[PDB]
Amino acid sequence: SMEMDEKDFAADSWSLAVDSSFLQQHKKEVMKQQDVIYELIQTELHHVRTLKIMTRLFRTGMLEELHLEPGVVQGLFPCVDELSDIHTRFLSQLLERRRQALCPGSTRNFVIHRLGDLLISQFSGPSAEQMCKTYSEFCSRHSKALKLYKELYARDKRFQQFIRKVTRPAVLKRHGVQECILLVTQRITKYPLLISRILQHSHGIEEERQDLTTALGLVKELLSNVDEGIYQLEK
Amino acid sequence: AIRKKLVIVGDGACGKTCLLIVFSKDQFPEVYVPTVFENYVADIEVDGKQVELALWDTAGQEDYDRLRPLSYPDTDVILMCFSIDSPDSLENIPEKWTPEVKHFCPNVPIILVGNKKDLRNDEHTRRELAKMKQEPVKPEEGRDMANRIGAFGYMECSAKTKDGVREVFEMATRAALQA
Ligand SMILES: NC(=O)C1CCC(F)(F)CC1
Numbered sequence: 001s002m003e004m005d006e007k008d009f010a011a012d013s014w015s016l017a018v019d020s021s022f023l024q025q026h027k028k029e030v031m032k033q034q035d036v037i038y039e040l041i042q043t044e045l046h047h048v049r050t051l052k053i054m055t056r057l058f059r060t061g062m063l064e065e066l067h068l069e070p071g072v073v074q075g076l077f078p079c080v081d082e083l084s085d086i087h088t089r090f091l092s093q094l095l096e097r098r099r100q101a102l103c104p105g106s107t108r109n110f111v112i113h114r115l116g117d118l119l120i121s122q123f124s125g126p127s128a129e130q131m132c133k134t135y136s137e138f139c140s141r142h143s144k145a146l147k148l149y150k151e152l153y154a155r156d157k158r159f160q161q162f163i164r165k166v167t168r169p170a171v172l173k174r175h176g177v178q179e180c181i182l183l184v185t186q187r188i189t190k191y192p193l194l195i196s197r198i199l200q201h202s203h204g205i206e207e208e209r210q211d212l213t214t215a216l217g218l219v220k221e222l223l224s225n226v227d228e229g230i231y232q233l234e235k
Numbered sequence: 236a237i238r239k240k241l242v243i244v245g246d247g248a249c250g251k252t253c254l255l256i257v258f259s260k261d262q263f264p265e266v267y268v269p270t271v272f273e274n275y276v277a278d279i280e281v282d283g284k285q286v287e288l289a290l291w292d293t294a295g296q297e298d299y300d301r302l303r304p305l306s307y308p309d310t311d312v313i314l315m316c317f318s319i320d321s322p323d324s325l326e327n328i329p330e331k332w333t334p335e336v337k338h339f340c341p342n343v344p345i346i347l348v349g350n351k352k353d354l355r356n357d358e359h360t361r362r363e364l365a366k367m368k369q370e371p372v373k374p375e376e377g378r379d380m381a382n383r384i385g386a387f388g389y390m391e392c393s394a395k396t397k398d399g400v401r402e403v404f405e406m407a408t409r410a411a412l413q414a
Pocket residue numbers: 012016262263264265266267268
């Protein structure tokens with residue numbers, strides 16, 4: 001992740017990220033909505049950062065430092081480039097909506113009034129089909145990736161040494177190989193939770209309550225499709 | 236510093252997300268309680284043994300019977316949660332969660348945790364339940380369920396007041412160590 005974005009999302013909430021005198025100019029219901037919108041973007045940033053750890057640090061690191069066949073690395077990190085592309089584009093649209101909303105003379109103070117349109121685009125048409133096919137694929141290869149990892153770690157000293165080495169920093173404590181794979185599988189089931197809590201505080205502008213209700217239904221349809229398309233593969 | 240995995244299971248409003256957040260932050264979320272929990276690795280020293288305890292939540296997975304089991308691989312302790320202000324979430328413990336947790340996680344210790352115990356003294360909670368011909372879950376009802384499902388133990392806590400929270404995670408660590 002990039003320093004500019006890490007600072008913008010370092011605070012525990014929108015009410016703490018913005019200047020105190022800016023928060024004071026808003027109604028409580030707005031602060032409540034903004035806190036949940038801020039959480040959705042903040043977790044998408046961590047989600048993309050997890051995928052970059054899997055691609056640059058774990059996946060590329062193995063190719064540039066070990067004599068593992070590329071088929072083995074593909075089994076360990078299934079659909080990671082494709083997942084990285086989907087969520088990095090989604091994060092880019094979310095981060096741009098926040099920047100467009102900033103006040104002049106400020107890099108912290110903003111209010112995002114429209115989110116449903118962006119959430120409908122992501123979870124509908126070709127973009128939703130690409131996520132449904134990539135997540136049905138990822139989640140079917142999920143167990144085989146854990147067993148391949150456990151097998152390689154408990155049989156290869158060079159792999160054990162590599163893993164102990166790259167995961168040594170404190171910032172990668174909850175981000176080992178198996179933890180990254182589970183963080184990714186669990187991501188899609190977080191969206192209905194976040195979108196429903198944002199929706200709960202978006203009844204002031206009727207065009208937005210409907211856009212968010214539509215987005216909520218689109219995500220549930222996507223999850224139901226990913227869930228139906230799953231069938232556990234084995235090594 | 237041995238590494239162990241914890242998974243919390245239970246119905247949607249059983250308070251499992253709040254419990255993990257309150258344990259992993261400790262300093263109470265006075266300004267904003269987050270909607271979701273990603274994961275956390277807690278450093279716990281119980282009975283003079285040091286453990287790295289990975290914490291996972293199954294919130295959002297309750298309706299997806301094929302996605303949910305992907306949370307279970309290599310789990311060492313299961314926190315089976317129910318809400319004390321919801322007698323119906325307790326009746327779903329033997330019928331829904333136990334046959335599933337024992338299928339994917341055989342021999343893995345299960346600790347039955349009654350969340351939201353503060354709501355026993357809440358007059359509004361008692362009033363709402365009384366309207367539905369009901370009462371808040373009694374301690375002996377929790378112990379009887381934990382006995383019937385073959386649980387390793389029964390514990391109660393309150394994410395709101397932080398009461399009982401440290402003891403649940405210290406005991407879960409002890410259960411995860413047994414082999
Ligand atoms: N996490 C929160 O909701 C707040 C409460 C405590 C703190 F101010 F230290 C940090 C933000």
